[PDB]
Amino acid sequence: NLKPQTLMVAIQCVAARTRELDAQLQNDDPQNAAELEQLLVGYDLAADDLKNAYEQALGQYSGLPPYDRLIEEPASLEH
Amino acid sequence: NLKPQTLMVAIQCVAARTRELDAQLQNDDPQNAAELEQLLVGYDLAADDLKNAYEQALGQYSGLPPYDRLIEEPASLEHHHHHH
Numbered sequence: 001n002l003k004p005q006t007l008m009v010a011i012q013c014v015a016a017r018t019r020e021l022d023a024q025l026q027n028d029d030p031q032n033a034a035e036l037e038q039l040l041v042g043y044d045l046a047a048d049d050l051k052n053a054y055e056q057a058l059g060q061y062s063g064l065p066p067y068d069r070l071i072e073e074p075a076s077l078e079h
Numbered sequence: 080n081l082k083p084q085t086l087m088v089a090i091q092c093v094a095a096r097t098r099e100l101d102a103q104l105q106n107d108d109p110q111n112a113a114e115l116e117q118l119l120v121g122y123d124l125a126a127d128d129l130k131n132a133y134e135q136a137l138g139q140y141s142g143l144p145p146y147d148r149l150i151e152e153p154a155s156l157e158h159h160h161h162h163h
Contacts, residue, residue: 001080002128009125010089017092046088053080 003059004064011050015071018043085145086133094150097122108114126150 021040025033053068058064081089097119104115130146137143 002132006120006125008126009121010093010129013092013096013122017095042084043088043092046085049085050089056080056106069157 002053004054004061007050007054007057008064010055010069011047011067011076014043014047014050015073018047019073081132081136083133083136086129086136087149090126090149091123091144093126097126098152099111100160 001040018040025036028036054067054070058067080162084131098121100122104112109115118147133146133149
């Protein structure tokens with residue numbers, strides 16, 4: 001089974017792609033947006049499975065950050 | 080301990096972010112190139128691990144696709160022509 005560093009990278013990358021697609025929905029053709037919206041529910045299901053695995057890892061290894069810090073949106077994009 | 084569908088999503092999301100960073104490094108005046116490259120090392124190590132995990136998740140007679148199809152570059156599949 002996967003290394004904890006791999007879980008961190010996967011969690012980070014899935015969160016980033018979800019935010020990047022959400023941002024485009026408003027100016028997208030509704031026809032195209034409606035199709036993305038269904039794909040994005042699949043991303044969220046994968047995100048939950050990943051969180052469950054990471055929580056198990058937190059009980060087994062030392063030196064790992066809290067889950068909520070991994071999925072935080074970077075400040076440079078907020079302010 | 081991840082479902083096949085979860086592994087497929089992770090693989091494609093990591094590949095997509097990798098393409099985005101590759102594009103930034105190939106452009107004019109990349110900022111903090113040494114650090115972008117440090118990030119890419121990490122992404123590739125995760126990609127290798129996810130690939131081994133996907134392989135192990137396949138049944139002996141699975142209906143799931145080859146790993147190489149998941150990470151193929153979208154632009155490489157396109158063709159473009161104006162009307163004559």
